[PDB]
Amino acid sequence: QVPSNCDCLNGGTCVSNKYFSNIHWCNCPKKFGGQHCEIDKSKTCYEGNGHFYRGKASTDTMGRPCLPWNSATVLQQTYHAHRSDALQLGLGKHNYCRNPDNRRRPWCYVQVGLKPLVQECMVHDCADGK
Ligand SMILES: *[C@@H]1O[C@@H](C)[C@@H](O)[C@@H](O)[C@@H]1O
């Protein structure tokens, strides 16, 4: 143990609070990591929660390409390319995943056997799949 009101690496930043007796925290870049932030990683596949998102992730949390919002199936669902608020998320002619409702990760109407179920399009990891 090394009570130093902080502990990072790779030249991290040793910070410490004083308005609560002791509320410090390793001050390392968000792209850092490694126990005490000893690596220059770069985790950030969605600065938001999935509201807009502008990457390439088009599959769901399984791998399927998910159904586009123009697939009559999703048209039968709710948030597709023919509801009334799809113009706010631009769902028509496109796929990826949208989260205009109440959810943390971006989901997409992906066919789940016989009913396009919204699945938080797994958007984790983003480095050549490795
Ligand atoms: C910790 O403090 C911050 C403000 C930056 O100077 C970092 O480079 C440093 O490690």
Side-chain angles (χ1 to χ4, degrees), residues 10-127:
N10 274 52
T13 292
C14 226
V15 299
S16 341
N17 234 149
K18 213 174 206 118
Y19 298 121
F20 333 69
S21 97
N22 255 283
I23 292 288
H24 47 272
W25 65 81
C26 228
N27 172 359
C28 19
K30 318 234 220 279
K31 54 227 291 192
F32 266 44
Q35 173 184 27
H36 281 135
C37 308
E38 74 176 291
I39 321 192
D40 208 300
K41 307 153 93 119
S42 74
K43 216 285 255 284
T44 21
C45 235
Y46 39 22
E47 298 143 26
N49 33 294
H51 200 341
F52 325 108
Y53 182 79
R54 49 225 251 147
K56 218 157 104 79
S58 18
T59 57
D60 59 288
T61 29
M62 266 132 270
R64 308 147 186 41
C66 200
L67 301 135
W69 317 91
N70 185 82
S71 266
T73 334
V74 48
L75 291 192
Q76 233 227 146
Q77 307 283 136
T78 337
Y79 265 66
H80 64 264
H82 264 180
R83 144 212 47 206
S84 259
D85 308 348
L87 38 276
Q88 245 261 239
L89 303 311
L91 293 118
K93 201 161 294 196
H94 147 280
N95 32 304
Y96 306 167
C97 26
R98 247 50 164 106
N99 207 88
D101 202 5
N102 38 80
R103 269 223 228 254
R104 296 166 111 255
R105 297 156 156 186
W107 42 265
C108 74
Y109 273 130
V110 41
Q111 245 214 325
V112 173
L114 76 318
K115 51 106 132 261
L117 237 192
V118 318
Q119 261 112 109
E120 308 188 316
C121 74
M122 263 251 281
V123 62
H124 187 236
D125 212 86
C126 342

